[PDB]
Write an enzyme that holds these catalytic residues in place. Structure first.
Site, PDB file in Angstrom:
ATOM      1  N   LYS B 202       0.806  -1.220   0.000  1.00  0.00           N
ATOM      2  CA  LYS B 202       0.000   0.000   0.000  1.00  0.00           C
ATOM      3  C   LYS B 202       0.827   1.253   0.000  1.00  0.00           C
ATOM      4  CE  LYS B 202      -3.750   2.627   0.832  1.00  0.00           C
ATOM      5  NZ  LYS B 202      -4.048   2.793   2.270  1.00  0.00           N
ATOM      6  N   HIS B 243      -3.687   4.698  -2.643  1.00  0.00           N
ATOM      7  CA  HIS B 243      -4.700   5.573  -2.094  1.00  0.00           C
ATOM      8  C   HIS B 243      -4.579   6.865  -2.826  1.00  0.00           C
ATOM      9  CE1 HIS B 243      -5.890   8.444   1.319  1.00  0.00           C
ATOM     10  NE2 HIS B 243      -5.213   9.176   0.447  1.00  0.00           N
ATOM     11  N   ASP B 334     -12.858   0.663   4.907  1.00  0.00           N
ATOM     12  CA  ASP B 334     -11.926   1.498   5.652  1.00  0.00           C
ATOM     13  C   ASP B 334     -12.328   1.600   7.124  1.00  0.00           C
ATOM     14  OD1 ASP B 334     -10.149   3.415   6.622  1.00  0.00           O
ATOM     15  OD2 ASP B 334     -10.384   4.760   4.907  1.00  0.00           O
TER      16      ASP B 334
HETATM   17 ZN   LIG Z   1      -7.133   5.831   2.095  1.00  0.00          ZN
HETATM   18 ZN   LIG Z   2      -7.190   3.855   4.285  1.00  0.00          ZN
END
Ligand SMILES: [Zn+2]
Ligand SMILES: [Zn+2]
Ligand SMILES: [Zn+2]
Ligand SMILES: [Zn+2]
Ligand SMILES: [Zn+2]
Ligand SMILES: [Zn+2]
Ligand SMILES: [Zn+2]
Lengths: 436, 436, 433, 146
Positions: B202, B243, B334
């Site tokens: 990520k 993201h 989330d």
């Molecule tokens: Zn995020």
């Molecule tokens: Zn997140």
């Protein structure tokens, strides 16, 4: 619920760009400027709603200094050593007084190129104290042995305090100075300032006069390092302001994509045509040179003969020719907040050879170019622009030295709030002790 | 010696991809799915061998949430500071309860984008506790001053905890967050997560709303840094999930080769055609926005007005148009494990405008695309795929909010083992105290 | 808000100290015990107000284990190396399961002598999970080359992790172990545990068998260091529990002012008279020895004793005979076979089942001294930590080894196991919604 | 783990900032707080403040309410540590002001030679006669409570 309207009639209204107006009027709805035009043509909408009215001789936008240094140094060390040795609390306390005086003089915006601007702007912004709008770079980025460097100290002491390696307790990454070498390190350096909230980035792209060992003719940082620094800034919508003297550093800064240059002492025909063609702000910062030429070296260290008259003369020609050639210009003093910023205006006119009208423009309308996209619509008395406005007693177009008298500024509006005015307290209007 | 066979007859069987079936039956040989088809057509081979049989109203594959955050934070600090201050033991203990509830709700796979997923998945995998299949990224990689960064703390405290430099005692390299600047540092960052066992990587490729200072319009990391991060992941057969909010970050992530995007708030016609053309998973994570729009800012810090309605609206359009344009979609909430993942389904249908059937597909059949090659054949009720199956009491195709009732899930199979069912204990079937 | 009253009638009520009662009843007002006595003599004021009643065969106070080790280690390393290598998240997760099983067995209080007890008790206390009352020492304090030490690792790796010098990122001061040498360093070590919230302090005052290279005959720490450690604890109203085998370590711990001793393997006439005269808790921890005697050592490192095993037994037996105050500790992870220690109390130490129950209940809060509330007994004013049984333990003490035999579990007057009561106890709700 | 301590942070972050060991760049020794354990460390702690120009020394000699986890009944520091802190101050002609609530901390501060006490919440007959007999300033600081 309802907008707070203030009307101001002016004998002379100097707007920043474009001709000044006679017997004009300006309106402020809340934080922004709602009307500018002759007194006759005020919308009746506003006449009905206003709860405040002033008449003043001269009205103009709030002033900017574009090269300031939020240091608040103790008076113990003459050189940059004070920068490191001074505890930031002492600096913060002092910077308060300075920001006050600044505002009291009609300076409503500062661009702090090295210092605690970010850390202090939060005591401004929560209203614990008052001051201009502050656009800080956090620390100036310098290479090792760069203009930023404190040569009188061992390298280890300096890089421990200001390097981008070896994180530690004690506000790592949050000093007046930041020493990075190499593409990897400059990335963190740029980013460390953004972390503090910086709205512009400052690089030392050439040797300087204030640092003890280094030569202003030569460039600093690699083209490689500067390209990265610019790109890092660009990605967060900052621009880079580069301190440069020698032509070598100047052209390297321009090639990298820097958009403001400071001093620019060895600027010549080639440099001016570039700064225009590429739209780069020229900030001469003449005050420093003239202050110490007149001082004849009181206040400095003996190795600051570097400025010499070779540098002093070159610098003047650069500024003059830049003006003549039509480079966009703004004004910077290179002093602490509360220092004699008003002087730079005088030297604009008297040394660079501007008209007072143009010198005002470099202090107002042009000055927000110094932070590029981080600037709102401001520095001009025009509808929609931010209500940062000041009022005068005497006409600066006749005598530009008027700014050197703080009492000559009678009204000071920042964000449409009144900080200095008739029977307005030291911390501005509707002020209350924040510690209760 | 002999395969353990379980037969399940279903009033309605929703397979993940393709039309649902009426009065169907499904078989499980050991860990995998042996048959799917109408009840009539069951192989007699299996009828002879089975030692277990259930009839349920509705049968579907186990659910995935694709954006989860294994934090287990103490409730003391509101911002990311809790992330650092919380002792991982406290977090681990809490994450146990969360993983239980998750499973109890028919969530059999989670993609943990930041947190202790790797470290906790081993207490799952040795069977000391129970939980979904966990595919963790270890820490989220962020630049200094990135969305990952804890702005309210001094830079040194943060980089001491989460930097890729200065190894030390105290589980260096194994936090919720990892701060790298420069091509050299990102290499170690990717590799540090692989070390923990991470099955996805990520990155914060744009500013975010949860972090205090940073702006979601702007990109983060260099294209240079991201290319490397992707390549590092690719070499170990991971993919990168990015993201992103602003278009700038979105396009940089796509150029670098990221294959999952989160939020994707400013996605437009150009972005959708790309994500298809390049086969990139879109994960909206709408829950967060709707939860706090309804909250009207309870639970957050005051600088999370960043979400605003400009962001909230943009985000919706992005999700809607992405659906309409036919981008591959999966579902992420989330939140912590045990949180309200079921909501995301509701918002898929009600805000994005999916059919319930398609929303189920985004939670099941598509969801393993979120870890690329690290995924087995799963998330679908089909021969050869992994026996992660759940049973319901009500038909979600009529009412999608059914998932918000944990009692509505009556049977939970993960790896063909039964963890929730009639007269099945809290730690699943044939459970025994592991500490004896 | 009115008080929440629950009445429980019992065929047999075993109170902790004093004779057990026949056909008795107990009342709970909110968090505490409001009445104990025969069913007949219940105050009518409570009969009028109650909103809950149960009848059970046997009622007794919630059990304590007084030597527990909140480790949650990965199964990779066989020695203490697992302690350091295991990421505390993995440990925490595992410790959740353990605390559940503990409660599910009627253990309502644990004294964690080394581990993450403090850090996990947080997740208990906000109700994110459930577990016994936890009284942790944070880390066990050991000298360098002490019983705490991980000898198979280089000294630097160990002191970097567990020393009281060189603060750093990565939860410095918050491990299972704490290595201090000298009077200056032990001051920080005691204090670092209090920082975590520890309610007791643990020292290794002698060599041990579960560490690779050190000898249990010899003392550890200086008398100087221990005096300070005791004083540091005393100032925050903790007491010190000392792990000791050799007589040398035992007498040094007693001289320093320690108030709980573990194992106490070489205790003799002189030690028993002292522990009584000075009022020091004796905790044998027999389970470990008997588990591995029967194992014939499988699962340990070759540096593990039949000599020690005997001495240890004699110490425990004579201590009982001599009337030393005793409590029970298993020395295992949470969820581990604590019930066994009861069996060995009776069968090896030679106590009556009644006395063994007393060492697991009424005496056990002495293990944390002033940090203890009134508890571990079924008596008016004491904390409502109560459990219910199906079989009479006084006839068969091994009944505790069957978790089903415990049918009701009350901690702080809240019901965590009972008829048609969910896995996380009564009125349970998902904390993540 | 004293009243000064920031319990909500890991101990390393706090002692890195405020401990008297491991000198470093970043104005080491010049914060709001100073954490010392043991007679050797308290000597540097007193001295680090004098270095800044301090004209009085402040100790937390008991638990407080404005810190997250510590109990005001109990004393803090050892009598040993306080005696030294007083002596170190005395040598530079400072005095020590002690923050105290519980009687335990109050009497330890008086025994060590502290000359100002703050809050003094559990002061009683015995404490008043002492503070007079020894000439110790009492500063209630009532405002916070009210
Ligand atoms: Zn995020
Ligand atoms: Zn997140
Ligand atoms: Zn300069
Ligand atoms: Zn400058
Ligand atoms: Zn032991
Ligand atoms: Zn032990
Ligand atoms: Zn105080």
């Amino acid at each position: 619920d309802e907008a707070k309207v203030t009307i101001i009639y002016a004998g002379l209204l100097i707007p920043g760009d474009g001709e000044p107006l006679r017997n004009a009027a300006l309106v402020i709805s809340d934080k922004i400027i709602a009307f500018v035009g002759s007194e006759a043509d005020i919308p009746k909408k506003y006449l009905r709603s206003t709860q405040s009215t002033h008449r003043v001789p001269v009205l103009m936008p709030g002033l900017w200094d574009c090269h300031m240094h939020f240091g608040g140094d103790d008076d113990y060390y003459n050189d940059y050593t004070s920068g490191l040795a001074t505890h930031p609390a002492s600096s913060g306390a002092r910077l308060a007084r300075g920001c006050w005086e600044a505002l009291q003089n009609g300076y409503t915006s500062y661009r702090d190129l090295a210092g605690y601007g970010c850390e202090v702007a939060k005591a401004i912004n929560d209203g614990t104290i008052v001051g201009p709008n502050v656009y800080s770079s956090g620390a100036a980025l310098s290479q090792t042995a760069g203009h930023g460097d404190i040569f009188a100290l061992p390298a280890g002491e300096v890089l421990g305090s200001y390097g981008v390696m070896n994180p530690r307790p004690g506000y790592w990454g949050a000093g007046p100075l930041c020493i990075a070498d190499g593409v990897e390190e400059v990335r963190r350096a740029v980013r460390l300032q953004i972390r503090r909230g910086a709205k512009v980035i400052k690089v030392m792209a050439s040797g300087g006069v204030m640092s003890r060992d280094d030569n202003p003719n030569f460039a600093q940082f690699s083209p490689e390092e500067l390209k990265v620094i610019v790109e890092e800034a660009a990605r967060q919508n900052r621009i880079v302001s580069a301190h440069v003297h020698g032509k070598a550093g100047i052209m390297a800064a321009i090639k990298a994509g820097c958009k403001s240059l400071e001093h620019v002492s060895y600027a010549d025909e080639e440099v001016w045509e570039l700064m225009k063609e590429k739209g780069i702000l020229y900030v001469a910062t003449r005050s420093v040179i003239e202050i110490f030429l007149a001082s004849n070296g009181e206040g400095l260290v003996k190795e600051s003969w570097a400025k010499l008259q070779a540098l002093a003369d070159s610098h003047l020609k650069a500024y003059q020719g830049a003006i003549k050639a039509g480079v966009t210009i703004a004004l910077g003093t290179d002093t602490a907040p509360g220092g004699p910023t008003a002087l730079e205006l005088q030297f604009a006119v008297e040394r660079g050879g501007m008209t007072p009208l143009e010198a005002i423009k470099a202090a107002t309308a042009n000055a927000p170019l110094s932070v590029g996209p981080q600037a709102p619509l401001t520095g001009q008395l025009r509808e929609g622009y931010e209500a940062d406005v000041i009022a005068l007693e005497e006409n600066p177009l006749e005598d530009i030295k008027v700014f050197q008298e703080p009492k000559a500024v009678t009204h000071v509006w920042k964000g449409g709030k009144l900080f200095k005015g008739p029977g307005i307290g030291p911390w501005g209007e509707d002020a209350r002790n924040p510690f209760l």
